[PDB]
RNA sequence: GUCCCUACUGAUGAACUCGUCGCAAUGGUAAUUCAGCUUAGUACGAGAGGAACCGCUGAUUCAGAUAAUUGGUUUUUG
RNA sequence: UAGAACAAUGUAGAUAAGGGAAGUCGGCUCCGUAACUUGGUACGGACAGGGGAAUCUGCGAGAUUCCCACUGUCCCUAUCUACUAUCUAGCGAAACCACAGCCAAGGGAACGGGCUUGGCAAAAUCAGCGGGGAAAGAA
RNA sequence: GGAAGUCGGAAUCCGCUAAGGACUGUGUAACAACUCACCUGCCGAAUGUACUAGCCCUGAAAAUGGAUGGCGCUCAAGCGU
């Protein structure tokens, strides 16, 4: 049943830099306590995102930050938060609020904020699913200053207390790209409607989907969207090759890359490795298929796909960063989620629809002046997207071996592969598919996924399609890759002449002509036989540019505003009094009644009395005494 | 080919759709979750169920994280719901347990923890090979 | 097997021992079977069979007459092809990016006007159901006609125009509606009915005038009912 | 002499059969094709008995024994024991044992000289096997697989072990058993050698899906079909093996 | 595996009849003028849409069933290009795709028209208009459907050629003895007729040697012409020769019985060698019965020897009529293919880094034999009846009675009742068939 | 801004002396699908693969019974 | 108002008492001591635990196995509330009522209950009741 | 490549004539072979092509069981005078 039960978990990662249409620490001037906390943490120099963002946040401007995971966005918005709050407030009502996608991300934010505010009297609360709604009631009674929450639970508690958020002045959206991918849009909009207009809005993300751009335009007051510069210029130290590959030879071509074009050692390796190969794919089914195929071939491979378990992703990523696995296969969304260290080797299995997505996946490497390699497998159907990539990068295309020494780093050089081994590899793939049934089932699943992904993938441009047809007609599509060698160029050419002049044959008559059908074919042939600078550069205006609905926790459809009253019943349960209205001093007796446990939070909390002792049972008196102890504890 | 066993006699089915199960092999999963039964007949609101030796489709709920949240065929080897064998013997097991098996009938693991049902051992020759206790 | 194995098996072992007799009997029984079919089977299948046998006998009679004659004895496609190749080459080469965005349509304009005006007078809207031609993508109509709504699904922009003397039909753009001889209001709004005079672009035909000149627009009478037939057919008045 | 057969349509011969140097046990079911193949290969040279164990057809995986004796699990009933005793000559001692691990054919592999057992059998069972079979019983796991009865086939002329046994494990096992061992596959890649084959000093019966290269390997290892079959054939004509099982 | 599973392609009239009958018989066909205008619109738009998705499903099946020429192996691509004119193939497929698109657009426009219709007459006319316009489209796509049907039939009959496997390309001049060897070596029914271009396609047969499976591809026949003025069937052969990693067996005909000259045969082989650049070339003197090699002119002998003195092109001898040496040439070529492929596989396993591959070490583990160090063997208790035994043979008249024969004589499979006490060896033979007391 | 009549269907019933054993006008009507063994790795097929008739054994649903056995329910207040 | 039969029901609404199911983002640092500038640095110790059910060896460092999450979600079980009732002795209404009351076709006025011509059709009752004997007015 | 009337394009004649097409189909890889067209011998007397006019079948049908009023009617108890 649950094969494609809902949808391919990694859908797409759409990015819009047209969203650009929005518009030391001591030298930055932080408080002494915050400075000592940062010194304890070890943030000697702020990361580039911090350096560009924190001054703006201190200048009280709403900002959207394009930054990779692990760039330090968490501290980037927590340090200004602590600097702004700087003390616990005796007036009831919180003013710091952050919305995070998942509980793990929320806990990471909790750890960051605690370590960055050790000593300061700020009260920070976590509000995520799986915890007791009563416990969250008690924490709101403790009256925190900072709220770190997941939006669904946030609305649940919002509806349950009818809380007043007018005191909130500081609002942060962490990983809003994940928020919108998981589908938090409507409830986020209702949160925004609840929030007072007089607030400072921070939004940290790695990508800017058009939905997120519209949300920012709707909810942000003059956003000074930010970004870096490694998110534009493909590091010139990146050297790229493109391989014309066939559908049935795709896996064989991927291993020739690994074997003869990369010299990838087999077995467990004896901080990434010297090789450091990442593989970017189209869906999780390709992820599993390629991972298992590589593992059978003998390659130390870790796989990370979209809807993978948290612990599993953690283990695989930790192995890749420690160098226990040298190949890492990711789709797009898992890649964006995981913090990828410096890489030397990038392989694009399925071509990306967006040249900007290609730019991200290749800026994954060739960093800090260290040279990087990018090999991309392209098919005839993906050739228009390759040409769109050409237009985006403004580089020249070299097809096959039109130039003797093409510069693969600055030129987009496309070629085929060593026919000899390519075939010895494709035969191996066919053999393993015929032998291992699990691999065959996986291959069929990825075939269906390929069909679905081709159906749902965004289209190319008309000019790209036309010139793709022209390239396919041209000779440059079918010869070797410049890398191989001029001697190969010699030997390939020794017979390529006759081979090509055989491939380019126009039959005089079909085997059917060799009846009414024969007459129809002859008429068909007769019908469809072949058909018989000067400008001023200074001023030449050119053409190209230079009851509302929300989903509940149970998943069953639930109305937007449904006050179950169980908060009032909570009040009745624990005989409490009226909650402190916004502004009134925190009530220490209620704080002591419901403040917090003694530290570590266990989960295993059932105290059940044992069954009544039986005389015929062996441990009669012992069971009787434990039952007596249980009734004494009550 | 649908994994419906042939020659299976009537016995009481006590493991309906959506049923939590122990995992008896060394494959890396601890529990399974029956969602569908092979060879079942859709009646009005009738929940399909399977007895010892019947192939089902199960999803792992706990175990090795790499295999977690994955769906595999399985065949059940131990059933706590009592049923009668043709020698007139009504019997039941301590828990509910099965083993992950490919659609042809081969096990992913290499050993079975605990006894194996006689019906499953007779229907699937591989389980008879990977079984140490047969009752 | 790998090749023409049925003829291979035929050449090695032959046919069934009564295939030829079976075929001859079936061919002889064809006449009785045809009469039985014509007199018995009933309901849309008779209608289909009858309409078929009519076509077959007409074809057979024409073939017999042609054979008798020959035994006794001892352009519009070209013009249309020229037009289509001219258009195809123009489109293929001389295409460069240029702004072209259509204004929002009369339906959502009316919806916005309704949002601006609470009290809806009964029957304040009446959608024009007959097919129309508008021209410009966006236009603000006068108050006099600001209450006729012409749907996009009914709007047309091209018509199949037939030239009699140069006997050929060409799909040509519609320039303007000159007279609809059923209602002056329909003429003003662009309602497209039968026998309707429209102005059609005759650029691709290449009509030479008395001054030797090339025609770029002529009158055409629409001669069908576009409301019933989802297309516009007109005959040039030349 | 290596032959191919199926019980009903299943390639697993060792599940439904048990072959030794003095008797043959065949699962009883429907037709007589399996019994006929076995008798046409053993034309009354040794007794062949249509038997059921614990009311099952898995007699091959439920029975363990050699030319000198036969052992059955405690679940086997007195009528089945009477059938076995009446069909088998007096030169063969039959005994029923109360092993916790009832799958004797899966936990014990025994030739006429040595037996390899699951390391978790009882002491009483270990020396009762040593008594009934009159062999040397060793506890060991092959290829980290604890079911030696299903993962190894043994004879007095050779032994076929799990395809993924290491060289150290293989030569250690060869040292203890005293016969050559080769890691090979049966029934087109299946790893259950014991469950897919019964073999004795002059006969092997495998499944119909067993490929020609691995059948030749089987014949060479067990020295079958007269010829030579020392295993030196396997060493010499390595081209077939490297091409087929690459 | 093959292309026999491509669904049949109907003609234009059959397609129209299928689609317009499905829409007639799978939907209700009675609406009344006294019903609501909304329900009339719904009825007619349902009819139009249903016809649309029916046509779209059939066209999509046609587009997706036929193999894509791009993603095929080069041999198959060139073979289909020669046999079917990939240009016309793509043209017809594009016509099908464009017709699908236009049918979809027609359906959309007429659905809008039906939305804005106000009479049952108008909805009827608009429905008949839509279905009628689409039928015009199919009638226009009459001829491509016929071409697609013919190509589908030939593709379903086409042999399965495995591009990357142990293969013997059997080639030569016409009437040399190609089919005569292929039938002698394999079970392929390839006509051996004494006329010229008897074989009009590639035939494939299968062989077993040293427990390995071999493919043998009989080619039609090549004449002495440049590769540009070259006929279709024999370019099918040259494509087979050009895109198959193989051992090419070129047949030579010493006699002039073939109909061609020795010098012409040498010229043709020299012309085709560039395609046999690295493929293993074995020229075997076919028809060595009539004119043996010894009875041959010395300068021609020396030309053949000079042909030997080039690369690893070697010449053998066989008569495919006297069953003389076809066996020997078979074993020679098959063994040398085996040794070449094992050499290549071991080289591929041994990488420049020096690390032995997983597959290579698995092969080593499977090929190693373990022997006890003590060097002592174990006794074998084999009875003498085994050596004094007689093979059972089903064709023998006086066989053993056998259980299959007795059960077939005494009933069937679920009818014969077996007596389990027949083999009971007891003290007294009459004590069998005795009922055992069990409970007292 | 508006408890009765009849239909269905059991269960009774006066008149023919009561009772026993029967006939059968008319009305209703019931079985359904799949799998396994043998045929048979046979016909067919280059290969890959791959049936059917006779015979035999089961299972799904539907229908009509039943309480040996095995579970469940206790106002038996045992 | 009292006797007989079996008499513990069902529905609905509330109620934190429990269970089955569905969804998931569910299962798996601190104290003391020593130097340094009030806060950090190293060393030592503890933490990152219980409850219930069980199994195996001779209470035993006893060893081994299984279960503990929330949800504005559904259902079920549990408590409370209200209405829930066959016959017999006595007493004893009301609504409603032109007359009636078996079907099918036809009876131009989207009209049939009485007419045509057809199916048919046998007293008097009891219980169950799910059909009919109620409906428009039209821009 | 092969194409002999019959995979294809164009012309499509003459002789013998009783008559025979540079061929109407089957068939061969091509032949070959059969067959049709046309002609002769036997038979022996009316045929056979296209239309028209009656009656009849078909020319479309759903959904409770029913209707030339019903039974029923066939050289009528139907149709025409
Ligand atoms: N005497 C003799 N005749 C042979 C020999 N090989 C083939 N022939 C004859 O050659 C004729 C047919 O040869 P094929 O095998 O069909 O020739 P081919 O090279 O396959 O070419 P195709 O004719 O196109 O199939 C028959 O008459 C055979 O008897 C041979 O070795 N000796």
């Amino acid at each position: 049943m649950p094969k494609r039960a809902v949808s391919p978990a990694p859908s797409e990662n759409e990015v819009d830099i047209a969203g650009s249409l929005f518009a030391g620490f001591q030298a930055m001037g932080l408080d002494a306590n915050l400075l000592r906390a940062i010194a304890r943490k070890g943030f000697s120099v702020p990361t580039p995102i911090q350096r560009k963002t924190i001054p703006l946040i201190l200048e009280r401007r709403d900002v959207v930050g394009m930054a990779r995971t692990g760039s330090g966005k968490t501290a980037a918005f927590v340090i200004p938060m602590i600097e702004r709050l700087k003390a616990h407030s005796a007036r009831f009502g919180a003013r710091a609020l952050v919305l995070s996608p998942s509980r793990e991300l929320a806990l990471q934010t909790l750890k960051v904020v605690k370590e960055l505010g050790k000593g300061t009297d700020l009260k920070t609360v976590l509000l995520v699913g799986g915890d007791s709604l009563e416990e969250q009631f008690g924490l709101m009674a403790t009256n925190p200053d900072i709220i770190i929450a997941t939006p669904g639970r946030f609305l649940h508690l919002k509806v349950e207390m009818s809380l007043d958020l007018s005191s909130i002045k500081y609002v942060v959206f962490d990983e809003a790209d994940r928020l919108f991918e998981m589908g938090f849009a409507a409830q986020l909009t209702e949160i925004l409607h609840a929030l007072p207009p007089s607030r400072q809005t921070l939004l940290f993300s790695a990508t800017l989907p058009s939905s997120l751009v519209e949300f920012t335009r709707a909810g942000l007051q003059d956003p000074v969207l930010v970004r870096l510069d490694a998110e534009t210029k493909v590091s010139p130290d990146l050297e790229s090759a493109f391989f014309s590959v066939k559908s049935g030879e795709k896996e064989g071509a991927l291993l020739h890359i690994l074997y003869d074009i990369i010299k990838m050692p087999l077995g467990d390796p004896p901080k990434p490795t010297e090789h450091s190969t990442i593989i970017f794919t189209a869906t999780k089914h390709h992820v599993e298929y390629i991972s298992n195929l590589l593992r059978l071939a003998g390659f130390s491979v870790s796989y990370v796909y979209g809807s993978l378990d948290q612990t599993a992703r953690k283990i695989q990523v930790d192995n890749f960063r420690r160098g226990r696995t040298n190949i890492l296969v990711v789709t797009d969304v898992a890649a964006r989620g995981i913090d990828i260290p410096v890489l030397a080797n990038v392989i694009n299995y399925d071509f990306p629809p967006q040249p900007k997505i290609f730019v991200h996946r290749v800026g994954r490497t060739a960093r800090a002046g260290q040279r990087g390699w990018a090999y991309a497998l392209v098919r005839e159907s993906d050739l228009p997207y390759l040409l769109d990539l050409q237009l985006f990068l403004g580089r020249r295309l070299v097809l096959g071996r039109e130039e003797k020494d093409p510069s693969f780093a600055r030129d987009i050089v496309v070629g085929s592969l060593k026919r000899v081994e390519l075939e010895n590899n494709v035969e191996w793939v066919n053999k393993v598919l015929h032998e291992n049934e699990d691999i065959g089932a996986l291959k069929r699943v990825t075939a269906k996924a390929e069909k679905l992904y081709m159906k749902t993938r965004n289209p190319a441009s008309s000019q790209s399609a036309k010139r793709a047809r022209e390239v396919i007609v041209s000779k440059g599509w079918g010869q070797l890759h410049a890398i191989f060698g001029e001697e190969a160029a010699n030997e390939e050419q020794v017979r390529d002449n006759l081979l090509s002049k055989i491939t380019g044959y126009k039959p005089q008559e079909t085997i059917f002509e060799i009846n009414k059908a024969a007459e129809a074919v002859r008429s068909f042939r007769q019908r469809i036989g072949p058909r018989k600078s000067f400008a001023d550069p200074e001023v030449y205006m050119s053409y190209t540019p230079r009851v509302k609905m929300i989903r509940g926790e149970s998943g069953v459809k639930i109305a937007a505003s449904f006050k179950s009253g169980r908060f009032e019943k909570w009040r009745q349960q624990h005989r409490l009094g009226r909650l402190p209205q916004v502004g009134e001093m925190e009530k220490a007796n209620l704080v002591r009644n419901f403040s917090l446990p003694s530290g570590p939070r266990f989960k295993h909390k059932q105290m059940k009395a044992p069954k009544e002792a039986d005389k015929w049972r062996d441990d009669y008196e012992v069971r009787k005494k434990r039952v007596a102890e249980a009734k004494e504890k009550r | 080919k649908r994994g419906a066993p042939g020659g299976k006699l009537k016995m009481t089915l006590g493991l309906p759709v959506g049923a939590i199960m122990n995992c008896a092999d060394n494959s890396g999963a601890r529990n399974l979750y029956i969602i569908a039964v092979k060879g079942a007949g859709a009646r009005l609101n009738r929940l399909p169920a399977g007895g010892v030796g019947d192939m089902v489709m199960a999803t792992v709920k706990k175990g090795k994280p790499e295999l977690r949240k994955k769906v595999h065929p399985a065949v059940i080897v131990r059933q706590a719901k009592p049923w009668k064998r043709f020698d007139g013997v009504f019997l039941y097991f301590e828990d509910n347990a099965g083993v992950i098996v490919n659609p042809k009938g081969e096990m992913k693991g290499s050993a079975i923890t605990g006894p194996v049902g006689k019906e499953a051992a007779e229907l699937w020759p591989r389980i008879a090979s990977n079984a140490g206790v047969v009752m | 097997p790998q090749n023409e194995y049925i003829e291979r098996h035929r050449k090695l072992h032959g046919r069934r021992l009564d295939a030829e007799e079976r075929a001859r009997k079936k061919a002889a029984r064809e006449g009785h079977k045809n009469s039985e079919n014509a007199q018995n089977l009933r309901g849309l299948r008779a209608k289909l069979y009858a309409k078929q046998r009519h076509a077959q006998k007409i074809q057979m009679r024409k073939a017999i007459k042609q054979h008798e004659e020959r035994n006794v004895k001892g352009t519009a496609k070209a013009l249309s092809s020229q037009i289509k190749n001219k258009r195809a080459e123009k489109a293929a080469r001389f295409s460069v990016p240029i702004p072209k965005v259509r204004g929002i349509s009369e339906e959502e304009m009316f919806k916005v006007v309704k949002t601006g005006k609470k009290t809806h007078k009964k029957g304040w809207k009446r959608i024009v159901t007959k097919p129309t031609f508008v021209g410009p993508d966006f236009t603000r109509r006068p108050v006099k006609y600001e209450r006729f709504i012409r749907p996009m699904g009914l709007r047309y922009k091209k018509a199949n125009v037939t030239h009699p003397t140069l006997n050929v039909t060409v799909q040509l753009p519609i320039l303007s509606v000159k007279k609809n001889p059923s209602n002056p209001l329909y003429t003003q709004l662009g309602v497209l009915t039968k026998g309707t005079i429209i102005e059609v672009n005759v650029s691709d035909l290449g009509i030479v005038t008395a001054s030797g000149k090339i025609a770029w627009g002529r009158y055409a009478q629409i001669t069908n009912n576009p409301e019933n037939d989802g297309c516009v057919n007109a005959v040039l008045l030349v | 002499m290596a032959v191919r057969a199926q019980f009903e349509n299943s390639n697993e011969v060792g599940v439904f059969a048990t072959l030794t140097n003095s008797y043959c046990l065949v699962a009883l079911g429907a037709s007589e094709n399996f019994y006929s193949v076995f008798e046409a290969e053993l034309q009354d040279v040794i007794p062949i008995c249509r038997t059921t164990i614990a009311g099952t057809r898995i007699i091959g995986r439920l029975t363990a024994g050699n030319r000198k004796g036969l052992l059955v699990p405690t679940t086997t009933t007195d009528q089945e024991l009477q059938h076995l005793r009446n069909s088998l000559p007096d030169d063969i001692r039959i005994q029923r044992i109360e092993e916790r691990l009832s799958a004797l054919g899966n936990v014990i592999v025994c030739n006429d000289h040595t037996a390899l057992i699951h390391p978790d059998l009882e002491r009483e069972t270990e020396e009762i096997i040593a008594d009934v079979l009159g062999v040397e019983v060793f506890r060991q796991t092959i290829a980290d697989h604890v079911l030696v009865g299903s993962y190894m086939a043994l004879s007095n002329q050779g032994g076929l072990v799990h395809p993924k046994t290491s060289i150290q494990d293989q030569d250690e096992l060869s040292s203890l058993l005293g016969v050559p061992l080769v890691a090979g596959s049966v029934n087109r890649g299946s790893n259950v050698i014991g469950g897919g084959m019964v073999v004795n000093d002059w006969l092997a019966v495998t499944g119909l899906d067993t490929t020609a290269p691995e059948l030749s390997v089987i014949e060479s290892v067990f020295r079958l079909g007269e010829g030579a079959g020392p295993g030196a054939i396997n060493t010499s004509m390595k081209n077939t093996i490297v091409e087929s099982f690459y | 595996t093959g292309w026999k599973d491509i669904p049949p392609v109907p003609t234009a009239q059959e397609f129209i009849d299928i689609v317009l009958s499905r829409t007639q018989r799978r939907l209700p066909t009675q609406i009344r003028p006294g019903f609501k205008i909304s329900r009339i619109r719904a009825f007619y738009t349902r009819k139009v849409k249903f016809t649309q998705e029916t046509c779209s499903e059939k066209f999509g099946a046609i587009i997706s069933s036929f193999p894509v020429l791009s993603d095929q192996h080069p041999f198959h691509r060139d073979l289909m290009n020669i046999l079917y004119d990939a240009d016309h193939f793509k043209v017809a497929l594009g016509q099908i795709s464009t017709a699908k698109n236009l049918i979809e657009t027609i359906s959309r426009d007429y659905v809008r028209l039906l939305k804005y219709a106000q009479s049952l007459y108008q909805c009827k006319q608009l429905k008949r208009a839509a279905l009628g316009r689409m039928a015009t489209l199919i009638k226009r796509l009459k001829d491509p459907l016929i071409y697609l049907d013919q190509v589908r039939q030939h593709l379903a009959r086409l042999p399965d050629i495995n591009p990357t496997t142990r293969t013997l390309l059997v080639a030569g001049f016409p009437n040399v003895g190609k089919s005569s060897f292929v039938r002698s070596v394999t079970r392929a029914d390839t006509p051996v007729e004494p006329y010229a271009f008897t074989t009009k396609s590639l035939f494939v047969g299968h062989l077993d040697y040293k427990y390995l499976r071999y493919q043998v591809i009989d080619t039609p026949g090549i004449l002495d012409h440049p590769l540009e003025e070259m006929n279709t069937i024999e370019m099918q052969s040259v494509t087979a020769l050009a895109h198959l990693r193989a051992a090419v067996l070129y047949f030579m005909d010493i006699s002039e019985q073939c109909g061609f000259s020795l010098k012409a045969q040498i010229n043709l082989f020299k012309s085709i060698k560039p395609l046999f650049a690295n493929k293993m070339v074995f020229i075997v003197l076919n028809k060595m019965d009539i004119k043996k090699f010894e009875e041959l002119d010395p300068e021609m002998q020396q030309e053949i020897n000079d042909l030997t003195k080039s690369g690893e092109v070697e010449i053998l001898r066989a008569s495919c009529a006297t069953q003389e040496g076809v066996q020997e040439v078979k074993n020679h070529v098959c063994e040398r293919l085996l040794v070449e492929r094992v050499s290549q596989k071991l080289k591929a396993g041994t990488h420049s880094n020096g690390n032995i591959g997983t597959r290579l070490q698995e092969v080593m583990a499977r090929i190693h034999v373990a022997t006890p160090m003590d060097g002592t063997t174990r006794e074998t208790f084999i009875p003498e009846a085994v050596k004094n035994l007689k093979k059972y043979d089903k064709n023998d008249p006086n066989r053993r009675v056998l259980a299959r024969d007795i059960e077939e004589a005494n009933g069937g499979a679920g009818v014969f009742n077996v007596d389990l006490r027949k083999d009971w060896i007891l003290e007294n033979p009459e004590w069998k068939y005795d009922k055992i007391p069990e409970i007292f």
Side-chain angles (χ1 to χ4, degrees), chain C residues 84-96:
Chain C
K84 296 159 105 170
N85 296 115
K86 288 182 182 179
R87 307 166 168 183
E89 307 149 323
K90 298 298 293 295
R93 304 171 70 51
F94 292 162
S95 296
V96 65

Side-chain angles (χ1 to χ4, degrees), chain E residues 172-181 190-200 218-221 251 253 257 285-290 318-322:
Chain E
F173 246 111
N175 233 23
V176 68
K178 275 169 314 244
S179 307
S180 73
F181 171 75
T190 313
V192 182
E193 302 179 77
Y195 69 94
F197 255 94
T198 304
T199 311
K200 281 124 172 118
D218 183 338
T219 71
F251 291 156
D253 187 73
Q257 193 74 250
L285 273 20
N286 213 295
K287 302 220 202 100
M288 229 250 319
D289 36 285
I290 16 192
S319 162
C320 309
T322 67

